[PDB]
Design a protein around this ligand. Structure first.
Ligand SMILES: Nc1ncnc2c1ncn2[C@@H]1O[C@H](COP(=O)(O)OP(=O)(O)O)[C@@H](O)[C@H]1O
Ligand SMILES: N#Cc1cc(C(=O)Nc2cc(F)c(=O)n(CC(F)F)c2)sc1C(F)(F)F
Length: 576
């Protein structure tokens, strides 16, 4: 192999010198051999099963007829030993159909797994919520977090006491020495809306190191017309055709490695490769549009949206954590206030205004939303919802927070009504009538979670918890808010300490969604998504022009030297 490479190298170097026309005749012969081969390998009855019901293990909702065919389709794939792409439009039950598959195979094929599901990090909590709702019997692992955390889980893996494991791209790559070893019965991956640049590296590693018989690719976009992408799709769906862990550019150039001379396809040659790969992949792709199944669309569409913390949120959080019975119950109240807004702490707001350039000591404008992950995220939801004439219902369990909520709506000029436990039955009735009468210009209905029929509201933003209706629960990243979503006086104290088991993290991937994932959860149609994408770039235009540009979240570099390493000061400003 060195001996041959040394010689075959000198062979190519000697033709370049002594018969340049013969050297050209060879390379053009080699180029065509790669094409002819590519075409030749791709130039190529089935087992029936009818699926009348869903799994008995699938509960708390019954499948739509179209989703039933999705299940029946992916089962047909299974029996006939095939891979697939479920590419249904956004909001049609791709996550619910994947759970219907696993639960059906566990029941009727006694296939207990293990099932590997790879998802974008921002939607992990979304996946884990919808498994808890629809298939709680299923035993699942969440392989992510600090090494300490990941190692904690190795016993349960070697053991094999689990049906499903969810993880993200970095852990599939970082921890191959743990995860590749497992003998996965299934390898389901979530691309999100569209293929991203980092998915080429993922395709290669997967069929370099991992051993999964069955594969599914979940996606929101239809079959693309670019060679490099479609190569990764061929080698994920049908790896046995070319048994290669390469990019198309490397695979095609393989024979010219010793030439030291790259080879590039022309217009005619490209279109043909693309037109073929299209024809090879087409039969393996099921895509139903919202309009095709209009009379079966889900009535309630739920999603979980994620928040970073401001630099301020972090420092306050770390303080109230490492300072910590109904004392615990109290420590969980303070951590919820921070995730909600740091300026709930009056003395923190006043001192920061002095430093942000407000003599008066009352924060206003953008600086309201900039100090809270959740408020900053809400600022990217509500404008969009309003621009599509959607009428929101926003739950806020804390009556303290509502002062800051009202001041935020004031800033963005959102017309609203408020309803608390400080509202009499006479006042209540009238407020509801005002929101519900046809034409009401009242956009938001701010509520304190204490019976009330707001049929006028077609959107529900849960802000802090314990005729299609879109529900959006906000949730802070690596916070208590994650732990509350996951749902004997010695054991009821050990439960409140399981709520408090925090660990500081430094993952690679963003735990907050990009603009495409987010507008997919807010939007009910292709027009809403399209608009929201423009509204997002309109915000990037506004910021670009603005002379005094600040990031959307307050970062450490713009903090005062009196909050940075001063457990006294934080305590001096937070206490009551
Ligand atoms: N057959 C159904 N019955 C009840 N709710 C459903 C059904 N199908 C989907 N939903 C709801 O609609 C939403 C669909 O989420 P999902 O389809 O998994 O995400 P996406 O379609 O964006 O991949 C969820 O809130 C789910 O509970
Ligand atoms: N994540 C990840 C990931 C995404 C992959 C991919 O093939 N995306 C492509 C490539 C297309 F060409 C295309 O048309 N589409 C749309 C089609 F589904 F109709 C998708 S492969 C992969 C893996 F293996 F890394 F997990």
């Amino acid at each position: 192999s060195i001996a041959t490479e040394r010689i075959e190298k000198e062979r190519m170097r000697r033709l370049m010198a002594e018969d340049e026309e013969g050297y050209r005749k060879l390379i053009d012969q080699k180029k065509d051999r790669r094409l002819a081969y590519l075409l030749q390998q791709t130039d190529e009855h089935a087992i029936s099963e009818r699926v009348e019901k869903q799994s008995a293990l699938l509960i708390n909702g019954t499948l739509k007829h179209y989703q039933l065919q999705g299940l029946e389709w992916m089962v047909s794939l299974y029996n006939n030993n095939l891979n697939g792409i479920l590419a249904d439009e956004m909001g049609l039950g791709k996550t619910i159909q994947t759970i219907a598959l696993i639960t059906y195979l566990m029941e009727h094929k006694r296939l207990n797994g293990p099932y590997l599901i790879i998802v974008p990090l921002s939607t992990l909590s979304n996946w884990t919520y919808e498994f808890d709702k629809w298939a709680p019997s299923v035993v699942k692992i969440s392989y992510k977090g600090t090494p300490a955390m990941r190692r904690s889980l190795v016993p349960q893996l070697r053991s094999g006491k689990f049906n499903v494991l969810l993880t993200t791209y970095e852990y599939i790559i970082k921890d191959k020495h743990i995860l590749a070893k497992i003998r996965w019965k299934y390898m389901i991956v979530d691309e999100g809306h569209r293929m991203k640049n980092h998915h080429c590296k993922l395709t290669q590693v997967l069929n370099t190191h991992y051993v999964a018989p069955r594969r599914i690719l979940l996606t929101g976009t239809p079959l693309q017309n670019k060679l490099p992408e479609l190569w990764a799709l061929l080698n994920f769906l049908l790896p046995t055709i070319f048994k290669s862990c390469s990019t198309f550019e490397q695979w095609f150039n393989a024979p010219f490695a010793m030439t030291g001379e790259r080879v590039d396809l022309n217009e005619e040659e490209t279109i043909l490769i693309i037109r073929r790969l299209h024809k090879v992949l087409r039969p393996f792709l099921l895509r139903r549009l919202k309009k095709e199944v209009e009379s079966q669309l889900p009535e309630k569409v739920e999603y979980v949206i994620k928040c970073d913390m401001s630099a301020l949120q972090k420092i306050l959080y770390r303080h109230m954590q490492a300072k910590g019975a109904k004392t615990l119950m109290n420590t969980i109240m303070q951590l919820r206030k921070i995730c909600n807004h740091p300026y709930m702490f009056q003395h923190i707001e006043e001192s920061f205004a002095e430093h942000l350039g407000y003599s008066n000591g009352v924060i206003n404008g953008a600086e309201l939303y900039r100090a809270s992950g959740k408020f900053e995220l809400l600022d990217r939801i509500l404008p969009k919802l309003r621009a599509t004439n959607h009428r929101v219902l926003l739950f806020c369990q804390m009556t303290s927070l509502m002062t800051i909520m009202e001041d935020y709506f004031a800033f963005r000029n959102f017309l609203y009504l408020r309803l608390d436990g400080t509202t009499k039955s006479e006042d209540r009735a009238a407020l509801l009538k005002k929101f519900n009468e046809p034409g009401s210009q009242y956009f938001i209905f701010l509520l304190s979670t204490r019976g009330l029929n707001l049929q006028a509201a077609d959107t529900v933003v849960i802000f802090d918890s314990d005729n299609e209706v879109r529900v959006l629960r906000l949730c802070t990243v690596n916070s208590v808010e994650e732990k509350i979503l996951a749902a004997s006086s010695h054991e009821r104290r050990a439960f409140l300490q399981a709520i408090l088991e925090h660990e500081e993290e430094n993952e690679e991937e963003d735990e907050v969604p990009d603009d495409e994932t987010l507008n997919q959860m807010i939007a009910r149609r292709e027009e809403e998504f399209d608009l929201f994408m423009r509204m997002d770039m309109d915000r990037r235009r506004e910021d670009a022009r603005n002379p005094k540009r600040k990031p959307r979240l307050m970062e450490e570099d713009e903090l005062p030297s009196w909050i940075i390493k001063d457990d006294a000061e934080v305590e001096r400003l937070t206490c009551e």
